Amino acid sequence: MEIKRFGRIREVIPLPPLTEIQVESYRRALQADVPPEKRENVGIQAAFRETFPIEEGLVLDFLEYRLGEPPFPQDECREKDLTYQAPLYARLQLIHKDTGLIKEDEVFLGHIPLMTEDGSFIINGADRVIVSQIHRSPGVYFTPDPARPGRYIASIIPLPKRGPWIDLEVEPNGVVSMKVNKRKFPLVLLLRVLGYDQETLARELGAYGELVQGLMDESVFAMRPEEALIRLFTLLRPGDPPKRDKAVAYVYGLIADPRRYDLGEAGRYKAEEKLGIRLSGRTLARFEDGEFKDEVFLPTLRYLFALTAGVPGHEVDDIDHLGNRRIRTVGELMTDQFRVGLARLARGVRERMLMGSEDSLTPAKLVNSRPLEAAIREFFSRSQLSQFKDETNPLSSLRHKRRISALGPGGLTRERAGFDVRDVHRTHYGRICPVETPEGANIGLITSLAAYARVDELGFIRTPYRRVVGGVVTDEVVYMTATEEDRYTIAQANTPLEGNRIAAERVVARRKGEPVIVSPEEVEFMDVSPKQVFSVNTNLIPFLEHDDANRALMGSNMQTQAVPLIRAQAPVVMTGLEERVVRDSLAALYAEEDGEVAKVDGNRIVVRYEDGRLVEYPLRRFYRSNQGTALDQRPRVVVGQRVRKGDLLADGPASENGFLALGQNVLVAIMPFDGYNFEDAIVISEELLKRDFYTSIHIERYEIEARDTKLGPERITRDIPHLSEAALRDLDEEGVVRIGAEVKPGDILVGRTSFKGESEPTPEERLLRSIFGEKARDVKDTSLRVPPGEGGIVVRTVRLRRGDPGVELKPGVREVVRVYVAQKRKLQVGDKLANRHGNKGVVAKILPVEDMPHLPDGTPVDVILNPLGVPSRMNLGQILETHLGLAGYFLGQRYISPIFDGAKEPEIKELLAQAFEVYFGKRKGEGFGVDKREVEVLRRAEKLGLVTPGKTPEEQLKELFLQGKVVLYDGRTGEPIEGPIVVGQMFIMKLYHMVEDKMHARSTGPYSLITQQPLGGKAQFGGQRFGEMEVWALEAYGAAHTLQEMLTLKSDDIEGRNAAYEAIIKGEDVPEPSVPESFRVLVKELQALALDVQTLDEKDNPVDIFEGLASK
Amino acid sequence: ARTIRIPVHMVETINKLSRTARQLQQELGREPTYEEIAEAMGPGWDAKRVEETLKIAQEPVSLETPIGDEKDSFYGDFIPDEHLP
Amino acid sequence: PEWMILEAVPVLPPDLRPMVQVDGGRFATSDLNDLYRRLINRNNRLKKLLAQGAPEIIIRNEKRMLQEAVDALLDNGRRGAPVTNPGSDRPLRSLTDILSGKQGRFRQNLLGK
DNA sequence: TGCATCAGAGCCCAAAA
DNA sequence: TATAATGGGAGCCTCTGATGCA
């Protein structure tokens, strides 16, 4: 079909590689493909250079590292619950400074996880994403002192964990104080340690009249730099003997040591630029020629005084400005943990270079890599920034990799965050999306990288702009940081152009984010596109300019939750980004070079290239994602087809011919329906199920271990005590359910026996067994069964024993069986649907086709959406989307309407007119005239001012069709709806929240160990939590016995809950409750605290709630 | 050092197994199997015995270990009670 | 008033600080057992140092270590550094922590279930 | 005696994991 | 059961009330 694209904006550059923030960060960090001599000092390399050489006369030096090849490919790691990783080795030379002896060896440091092609990791078999972390850039900032006006605080901030923060203040007493680790002292003392004299300080700061005297302290000047260093050490470190070598070591490590104190590389540049100096390194001072030599402090002190006096050119810094906030990407975070483990490894090395043999030592004997392996293993498994990959659909993972978190180690906590950080800063323009953020507690903490944004080497987000010189728009694009952007006047991307020339007398531009009207002579740059302001998810919302931001937010976020549908289609109204998302996602498969297709299968595609070489592409079929949606690729080409470089070969999941397909295009009527549409609920036609729209495949993994016990081995067997052949029917000889079997709740998946607890033969069971004459078996039935509410078709079984090639399990485990069960899920009542504009609702009613509202020519609608959802939400894009969708339904076409440069109303009306000709002119030739009911509707419509009175019925119907309204017949009555109704094609997705997953109920079940209260959650067969607020509700109702049940018979009252069950199965009423067991726990816990808790009667005599059991 | 106390001599064997396995991993460029450790340990050691030794050496984990979410759930809360009926 | 000083320290019933075998045959245990273990070890060492007539420096270090150990058991983190399990930053959960807070005994299991 | 400073006390629910 | 060895090592919000200060 035709695809008609609107908009006049020509984008000079395409979107960058969308996962480059991940892929490029880690590639730069490992530098695996660089030959060692050519590596720059960055990532792991920089870490090695930092840790080495490791001194005492033994000295160990670092030569170079190398990364091997992965022991197992990616697919294999996922299968075997392995980390996809490479062996890391380091060439080290041991030197004896006394002897000269040199032993050199390459020591094995363990493995490092490798990133896959799409920017994710495989850690213990599961796919994970490392989320970038936003934080305050290192540097020197000046903020106003909130308590005392006209005063300022100078804050020197290094990288997290790479040094202390310093605060410079001018105290009310007049002396300038320095704050380090919460202690204050006169800054003059520290200045004296650097070798400063009254002359130098007088000439430097003298310019500021009254302030320099606060620096002057006679007593401090009396002591020489040596005396001042010992004095300061005694101020900062009470008790510790102030040995001169000891003091230098401490202060050196605190200030001048590049190993213990690291400003960023971004920290260094920001300091150099702010104070107008050049730093020789990343430390606040140096140790040179035996003494301390200042670097930062005097320039920082100079700027602070100049600001307090109000000298022009000294400013406070906006700390939420995106010039002072930078991103720590995968490479930086991992390298940080690498550096920690490396420092720990050095402790072991130095400790081993004393207690060992001074003669026989290799580098292999000296180095223990366990600390290093643990730091990396800790980061990847347990870090907060290492997250279980979101792969519900391909857009999910692309979005996850492009996410920015302000949380995690070294960042904000969630309760400790006020408005300022969560705000949308003016500098977010083009860098962080203003729309895509969580609606809940995390709003503003979790954000998304903008579509055209890229992170530079220093970690600042940059966005592209086109240069405009004289008035001509060049094609040269400049990526700017927020700080540099503030210098220029930047015109909007839609400003009219004839050729490359600006065609308007007054243009809309920004100066430091402030919008201003300006002459073309004043225009320095221009936006690349509208797209650059928003995230990838937001850019997928057509007519976004017509949607209130609060609803666009939900629209963005919910596309992440879209389930891959077996019939999935791309939307009839696209934004033009839907091809790029699939291609960068790597879900879909494309041709490497030009060639001809040799073979096409469900499982594989063979392509013959220009070289003559025959390349085979295997296809991923029905694989289970982290969230249990089916990822499967389908071949879109045929044998003998000539393909070009980059032509589509196979469609990934949730893609249609290479376009992102998150849902279906359905025919919707906007109208109330008998209250089944009420309060965002949705009414749908049974026709959707009939043609398998909104049907999705889901796979669940079940697992069971057979292990060695002290009571004897668990065995996975088909021989299970007391089971009929009916119960075992679908189990094979070995006890595993057969592939292709249908399993329902209660069915056995894997048969397993466990040796009976050592108490086991109860005397009651002994007599019972004796009566029937069946020996009580030694083992009990522990078989894995289908949980309540689950089940499907068995598509896979994996069995792994001990002692079979290639497999070694965790200690004690004989064998592991995994069963993959698939289900085809038809849309049903309670499943959740949404569109891209933030309209979301649960399916409340499925009507038979004869009840569905229908057009005069007999076509029934698919979905009925209530109009009451539009006006309060103010998301009108869905309305425009429906109108253009109506034209396309009859014209047989789809559209690309870009965001903010889109199809406008007049253009949509033209298409609607051409459509009416097809919807109506066809009929007039077929020998049918206007309907009687169409006449009644036209009458009511002319009473509403929709149609012009006096025109023919055909003319009036067309007037309504240009308004997107049609005559609609109620399938129940046959009578029309008394008014014309908005009908068109809408793109609607079936989201990840499905009633099948959430429906849960419990009579009785598992209880917790200490509290004896029911466990939580559906997976444990838990009970619902009746919490503090629920009790209040029962209290306010005065329902004392209902509440008492919740607190006793229905929870941790053991005698009570036991007695209640027996009563109910006997038809008796439930008995009076007893003491809740968790109160007894409370009493004993208070006794453990040496508090005597006594229950008393009205006579103040003790009442024993333990019934004699705890008293002698 | 252990919540479950181990005889001093048995701790010596466990530590020997660690040193041995760590050496083996440093020459082999990967973690050794149970069988490779049994060779390195000399006579008397087969793969089964290396596994049994590792099982005894496992330290318990806290019931108070946090479970995802936020600071909202404990590991012990997900453990059913099999003793009380 | 002298009851505010402890001579005999109570020991909570074992099932309220359980040692249980989980699914894999692995053991999971309450933090209180480690807090008690620290206490017992230091107390026994104190008995031994006393019987062997150690200098006052040794006895004082031991006694102050003993107070801190009781402190960790009853309210950990209240005074001084919170006692943690090795290779974890997680403070061990003491009796005070069990009683109080959103996750404590009163609000979690008593005013709601 | 009237003012400052610091230690310690709190910071939504249910759901999930 | 014996060469001699002798002092550690690290860090990221508001209200209310007691405590220590002119």
Ligand SMILES: CC(=O)O[C@H]1[C@H](C)[C@H](O)[C@H](C)[C@@H](O)[C@@H]([C@H](C)OC(=O)C(C)(C)CC(=O)O)CC/C=C(/C)C(=O)Nc2cc(O)c3c4c(c(C)c(O)c3c2O)O[C@](C)(O/C=C/[C@H](O[C@H]2C[C@@H]3OCO[C@@H]3[C@@H](C)O2)[C@H]1C)C4=O
């Ligand atoms: C076990 C696990 O993977 O869960 C992970 C991970 C979020 C998810 O699973 C999954 C990738 C999920 O993102 C998608 C999925 C569809 O989920 C959802 O739809 C819901 C609605 C449920 C999301 C929700 O409501 O939570 C949806 C994403 C959509 C949006 C708008 C989003 O941005 N959400 C989101 C939600 C969060 O809360 C955090 C978060 C955090 C950091 C640094 C983040 O950036 C977070 C984040 O971005 O610090 C905190 C205190 O704790 C962090 C706890 C957990 O991290 C593990 C990481 C390691 O795993 C084992 O040890 C480690 C330990 C640290 O816990 C979280 C981070 C924390 O709250």
